[PDB]
Symmetry: D2
Subunit: 253 residues, 4 copies
Amino acid sequence: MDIKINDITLGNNSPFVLFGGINVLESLDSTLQTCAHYVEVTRKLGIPYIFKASFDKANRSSIHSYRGVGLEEGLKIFEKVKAEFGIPVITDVHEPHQCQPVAEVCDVIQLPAFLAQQTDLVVAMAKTGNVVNIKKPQFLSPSQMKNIVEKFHEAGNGKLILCERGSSFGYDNLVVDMLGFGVMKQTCGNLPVIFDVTHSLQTRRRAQALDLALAGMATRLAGLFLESHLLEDFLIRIKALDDLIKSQPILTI
Amino acid sequence: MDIKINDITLGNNSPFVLFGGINVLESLDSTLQTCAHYVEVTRKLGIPYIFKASFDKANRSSIHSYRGVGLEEGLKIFEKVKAEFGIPVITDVHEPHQCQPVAEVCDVIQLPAFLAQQTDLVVAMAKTGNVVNIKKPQFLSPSQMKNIVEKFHEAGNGKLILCERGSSFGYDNLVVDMLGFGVMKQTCGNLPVIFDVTHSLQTRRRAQALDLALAGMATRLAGLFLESHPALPLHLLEDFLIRIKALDDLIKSQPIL
Amino acid sequence: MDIKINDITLGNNSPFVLFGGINVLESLDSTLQTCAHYVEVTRKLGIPYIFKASFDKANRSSIHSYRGVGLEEGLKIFEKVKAEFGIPVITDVHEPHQCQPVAEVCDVIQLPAFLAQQTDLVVAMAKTGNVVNIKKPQFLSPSQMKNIVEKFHEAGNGKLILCERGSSFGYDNLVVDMLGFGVMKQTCGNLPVIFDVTHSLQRRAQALDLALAGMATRLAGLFLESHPALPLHLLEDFLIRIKALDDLIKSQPILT
Amino acid sequence: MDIKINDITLGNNSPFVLFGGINVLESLDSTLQTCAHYVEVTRKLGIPYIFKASFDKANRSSIHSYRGVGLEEGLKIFEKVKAEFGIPVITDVHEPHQCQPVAEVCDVIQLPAFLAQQTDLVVAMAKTGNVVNIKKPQFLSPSQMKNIVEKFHEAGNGKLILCERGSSFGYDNLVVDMLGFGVMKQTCGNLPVIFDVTHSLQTRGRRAQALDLALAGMATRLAGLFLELHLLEDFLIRIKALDDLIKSQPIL
Ligand SMILES: [Cl-]
Ligand SMILES: [Cl-]
Ligand SMILES: [Cl-]
Ligand SMILES: [Cl-]
Ligand code: NA
């Protein structure tokens, strides 16, 4: 199942979409600068691109780390990003009451992994009718993603993206089960699956991120998700592999 | 470090405290019945007791599943429990806004394991000044507990309990690392460590719960956390606690080293 | 099911048996000194005791680190231990050819974890008719122990001990699943289950917490190593604590 | 570091080599037939190929299960394979005493995963001077492989291949850490690393799964792939495409 996000088609058989940006929104000027860089690189390579940032990050490393500019100013910034570059945007939400006003502006709303089972947030997100990115918790098996999908469906929204971020592997370390992508596709109706390489790696380097991104994209994925000419060299390699993989028909039976 | 909860002393070298009750509050009458049984049994065995229940099941499999009585009715039930039995109570909170009204009634407020990283909820809980039970996520190592403790300390609340519930082990399975208890004691300032045997078995029986509870308490813990239904069958509670008390008494009588 | 090892009764509802000794037999006099200390401490506390050592360490840190004294001299040392102290002994075997000559002298023979699926060794060990200790591989689940047991049974030997050594937990880390003891008892006919606390680790407070936790589940024995690994002089204090817990547990009927 | 195996160049920046064949040798005729198929498919795709089989099944579900043909008869069969097809072969050894006679015939000798820390078998294998394939145990981390490599080096053999077969993941399951390949390259002197996809899937062996997993591993730039209506060819076509692309990009 493909999802149209403005003029982008997101799907496990479509050219990969890059989701990237900055961790937390700080100011209009700084956001536009970082976004302009992603936009310039992705436009040069012909890669569809969706700008990501948090306006109110609830799982910060310290209680006083900056949460972001907050909802009202954050949405103003996202409007400006959309107006300037004509690209879609994605942001996370953590309170039910935020979902509607965020969804007025942000094309894709994201369900944090730690909130993935919180029924009230699932419902409030579903009811926006917007495209939703579901971050897969590290302790959930790929066959359990269907239960989250089922709750969104009950609440009336099927425009769901499944975002891999690795799996708990003993203490601290995460490992990405390359077989999990296929399991999610088979059990969740072939919804777009994207790969958050960055999270998957923070518990373990450019060479690593490249190996791990390439390995995942070799399984045929709708997109690559990054958390905060290097970007260019990286994306050239990902695009090479993605173009190859996507040009070949799915093996048939 | 010990924590006083009314007349209870909770600590890793004190007689174990039972945190027991039910999954979710369903009615006043059922709650009082179950509680009365836990109270009668614990009083005769001389085990300090704190009644546990959730007022809301926030993460059920279906949007349409029964969720429990809710905050306003739930707090009314907890008030009645406290008035009738004179014991402390514990419940979980899932939204920052709930922390203050819950804390007015409930002696211990609990941070759900799935929410342990939710910084706004930590801060809201800390600011109540109540005793807090931190459920250790299945995906977090015992040496990472200190980062959660640090957050509560930076927010001004040091009355913290660390609650083991097992660790992720492959897909859809949990294992309890009996060494993790000592790691949490050594890295988190010897705050009280308790063991949720019920949720540690989620992915696996009476015999199993006893073996696991005995093993954990053998490491010298402040408390045991469990659920029953009329989860262990409620009528087996007394026999189960006799065994746990026997072991706890023995362990706590031996000097540390 | 209990197993008689000379005058010792080994079983999940019997007083625990200590299996202890050293890593590798390196010399006679030092072996006897160490054994003497285990004997004195276990005799004082009334704990049945089986002396453990390897004569041929097949998995060494370096290719030329000393393997140990080898079969012929190792068995002579075991005979001397048996003659001097009148206790049983346990050692591991790595090759089918070693099973007979080791079984003639040693009261328990041990199947190394890394060799647990090697059918020729299983058969050769089974055919000795000796008591066998099966070391559970860190990658095998407790419900897969029955398959090793089955192979010993097919080969005609039911005098089997199952020995927990922990489970692989991510990289380089082991966890002991306290529920695995019960799974092994329920699936393998209540054969004696013993706990190798030493190999389950990789320090004193940790070994004690882990040993107590395990023994709380009701086990036939505890398996450990010391160095002249727990320090040998703290042995008494350690065993006092284990015995206290074992005595309490075993004095209570199984919850039925 | 590359390894020459007759006319094959095995290395992490060389075209991938397929190591493939069968579980256990059962008879001369069925071996030749299977080998002929691998040869025909690999030759037409232009993929270097090494034939794999065991002469003995050392871990049998039953004491009375069939064990395979054994050393003497097995080595006869391997000699016939080499003579008929002019390819190298690989087999595993389980006892020190077997290493020299096996090594006279078999181009690559393999250290079984369960025996990787058996020092006497390491030494005996090293002393053959043959190319050795070291199967990484499911319970050993990638950073520990350097200790095995060190032993073989001390014993005088540097012609080592490191073979990934997955890592223990809870009970009765495996997962393959795609970052482990890089760890092994970086810590073991860039020795050839190959991927045993077959054994990595033991606990899951669907065709779509094997392909996804093989493609993912080969995306990390490996020396080879190890495995046991025209499934092999369809699979190899896709693997070769990806390998050619990855190998054509310069290392960063
Ligand atoms: Cl997570
Ligand atoms: Cl709970
Ligand atoms: Cl959890
Ligand atoms: Cl092992
Ligand atoms: Na004997």
